[PDB]
Write a protein that binds this ligand. Structure first.
Ligand SMILES: [Cl-]
Ligand SMILES: [Mn+2]
Ligand SMILES: [Mn+2]
Lengths: 391, 393
């Protein structure tokens, strides 16, 4: 059949890679809706090329401007505005799959909407599982929704697991299918070989979107992918290890009971993982060239040092404490990173802020997206506080 | 359900690795029969530990000595002798799987016997597919036999393929399951980085640089990789577009599969045949194999090289022979046995191996198949090669 898609977050690189896969397979995929935040210029250009039934801007004022643009550029496209409209396109009867690529907290509610409607979820929003993993997994089970991870690392892990595990994310019994270890890999960031002593003097210039680059330098991003992997693959602390792989040719790996390791590799292009999320359990052309082993260079590996990457230790800790600790850590880390970029704090202060905040909250019925959002707020003020003190 | 095994070639390193997996999983696997050639001392020790229902020595005189040893040490083990008995244990009703690990041409007939009986075949004999691939695949299809490859590279490829392909070896439609190509890897041998000019003066000492002496020379010339190439074609039903060769000097990666969407899967591991063998026993599940997990802190750097035919002319011959059919692959293999022995005996230079293979291959190709016709061919080609070696001096 023809697979029908809503793309939430169409104007970013995930959206672009998704559309490149769709362009390469026009007989298999079709765009019913596109959605974005406030980038009208990019949206109108997309809507012109794709002439979707719906187009949504989260920002109601941006929706108005798009509506007036598309009167000329895509006159059969119904433009809509606001949070309720994102849920509307995410839950349409005709839609099979939702690329859930709206970043941040704003992505929670419409991603959750697609989940409750039992859609196939191409998950590219970090926050669904970092903040509210237990809740997502539970709602996924309740509605029959299929969860297909888009992030390079989780997608790689998915490909290296056996089929029975792939079809059972959230609830999987890894040990009974022969899996010993999931090996989550990352480059280690620009300070992979920098002496721990020199981390205090690191400037924003050296550490480097800008927030995400700092999360790469501290490996707090990896910690976040760790938290997500735990929920996606139902993994204990011992089933889930982190390996530094500086060249990022290998994207992650799975260690089996019989000694066998499976690794996924590829050119650095999100169209590969996204293609598999669209096409699973089949494969499609993604407009990505085959890997050129002529150009790959040497592949090396390092065990991560927690003195160098104290944020990664915090995430892993937080991970097995539960939604409250992960929601807190993430909140605190947004604030600490902004504070570092503003020159209010040193590079190595980021982790201290994260650690201070994490300790305070953990001293204390059912969780909800709202209760956790309030928590995110609580933890944000606490972090704002700590930053003034360390200065 | 308890899986019941016959092990053909139990006294070698494949047999040992297989038994190590079985020892680790005594609740899943059980040894019905053990078979070997003429090493009675090793067999009696194995039969004492394992108390199999049957034990077979290919050599009838070795069978007699074993029979008398086992009358007390393993009193419920029926000892048997000869080629017919290898087939008998390979075709028993109670047996689910046959480890086909008798090497050389002698392994053909009993391996084929297990195939015709529709057994699960844990294939560890190179010759079945190098000499007689068309015939094996056809017989596999005809009886419902499952092929599970034991060689490290083919096993790796198998693990990197999707399930529908894995369950359809011999007949698989790779392109319809999203496979663009199979990437067969190898170390490139000790002349990895050696100037083509210096290959003429290479000595047996240098060519051998743990594995036997013939196989090490086939690793130096990449003729082994050509042989694995031939086998892969038949196992995975791979066209000329779908099968590639990559040098990977460290051999941490064992082989890989390139998919349509750009994704590559690779299989890696410690160099221990219990890993591949374990999967052949346990498929589609996994079992402990008594192999340690790979340690990435200790793996070192992983690199890749491009092979060139000036350095590895044998590889070009094998690939050529591959798509010419059983006659050419049977001939090449025969000729290469002789040329390698001739090199080790200091009769010919290292670089003469390929010439011998090439001379012989040309002669035969100027002119319905059976294991016997192909065995006769193997002998024809052997005499032709014996001839060419005298002339190169
Ligand atoms: Cl499972
Ligand atoms: Mn990443
Ligand atoms: Mn091999």
């Amino acid at each position: 059949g023809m697979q029908k898609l809503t793309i939430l977050g169409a104007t970013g690189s995930i959206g672009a890679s998704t559309l490149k896969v769709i362009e390469q397979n026009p007989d298999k995929f079709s765009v019913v809706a596109l959605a974005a935040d406030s980038n009208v210029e990019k949206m109108q250009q997309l809507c012109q090329r794709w002439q979707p039934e719906y187009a949504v801007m989260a920002n109601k004022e941006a929706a108005l401007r798009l509506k007036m643009a598309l009167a000329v550029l895509a006159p059969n496209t119904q433009v809509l505005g606001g949070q309720e409209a994102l849920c509307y396109v995410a839950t349409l009867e005709q839609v099979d799959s939702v690329m859930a690529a709206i970043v941040g907290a704003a992505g929670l509610v419409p991603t959750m909407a697609a989940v409750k409607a039992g859609k196939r979820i191409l998950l590219a929003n970090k926050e669904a599982l970092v903040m509210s993993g237990q809740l997502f997994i539970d709602e996924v089970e309740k509605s029959g929704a299929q969860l297909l991870p888009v992030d390079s690392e989780h997608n790689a892990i998915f490909q290296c697991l056996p089929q029975t595990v792939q079809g059972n994310l959230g609830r999987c019994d890894l040990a009974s299918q022969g899996v010993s270890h999931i090996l989550l890999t990352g480059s280690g960031g620009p300070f992979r070989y920098t002496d721990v002593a020199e981390l205090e003097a690191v400037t924003p210039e050296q550490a480097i979107g800008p927030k995400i680059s700092v999360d790469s330098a501290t490996m707090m991003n990896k910690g976040l992918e760790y938290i997500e992997a735990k929920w996606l693959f139902n993994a204990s602390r011992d089933q889930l290890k982190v390996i530094i792989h500086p060249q990022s040719v290998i994207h992650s790996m799975v260690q089996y009971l019989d000694g066998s390791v499976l690794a996924q590799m590829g050119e650095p292009d999100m169209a590969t993982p996204i293609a598999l999320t669209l096409s699973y359990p089949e494969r499609v052309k993604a407009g990505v060239k085959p890997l050129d082993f002529t150009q790959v260079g040497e592949l090396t590996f390092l065990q991560p040092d927690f003195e160098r990457y104290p944020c990664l230790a915090l995430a892993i800790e937080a991970c097995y404490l539960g939604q409250h600790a992960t929601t807190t850590l993430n909140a605190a880390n947004e604030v600490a990173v902004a504070a570092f970029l503003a020159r209010q704090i040193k590079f190595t202060d980021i982790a201290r802020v994260n650690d201070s905040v994490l300790n305070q909250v953990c001293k204390q019925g059912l969780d909800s997206l709202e209760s956790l959002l309030e928590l995110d707020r609580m933890a944000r003020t606490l972090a704002d506080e700590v930053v003034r003190e360390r200065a």
